[PDB]
Ligand binder design. Sequence first.
Ligand code: A1EMT
Length: 180
Amino acid sequence: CAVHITLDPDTANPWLILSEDRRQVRLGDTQQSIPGNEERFDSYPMVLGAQHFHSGKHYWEVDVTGKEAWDLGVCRDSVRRKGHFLLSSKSGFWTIWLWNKQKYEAGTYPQTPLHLQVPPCQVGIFLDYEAGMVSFYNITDHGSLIYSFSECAFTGPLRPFFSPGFNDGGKNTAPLTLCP
Ligand SMILES: CCn1ncc(C(=O)N(C)[C@H]2C[C@@H](c3cccc(C(F)(F)F)c3)C2)c1-c1ccccc1
């Protein structure tokens, strides 16, 4: 069920730099000047996969090597794009995140701390639509389960969700890379 993900530049916050092949994204030093369109996330450095999931099983892996912060998973296509919101399962985002170098958490509401013995350099994301399951795997630790969201009971199409961090004038400029 391994799927070739590509990043949708129409969704990408101006703080983001996408590679030419749209297989990579990183935080930029400054905001790019880019057309204001309704699909674009305007308040946080977030971008979606081009791919839409209506059903079935879907798997992809991401390199997070050298990063102090990131967020990965899946969201409803219907999520609001403009203004401020909370990354939570209750808001249509099924994600895990790193921040402050070592704080791993699942984006439940309220959030669930994760205790990772081996810090992941690559993360696997498995979506099972009919099961209502989004699962996260520690590829560095031989595929151990990081976290699973269960009985999410999805209605509409879902999208891959990425953020290579938030802008804090910090050093978190290494890219997220989609693994071949
Ligand atoms: C979307 C708002 N939001 N929802 C929940 C949380 C939250 O509690 N904080 C602790 C963690 C930081 C994690 C993170 C890691 C990498 C990239 C991003 C982002 F937002 F850019 F996509 C976010 C999410 C926040 C948040 C709070 C402060 C600053 C920015 C966001």
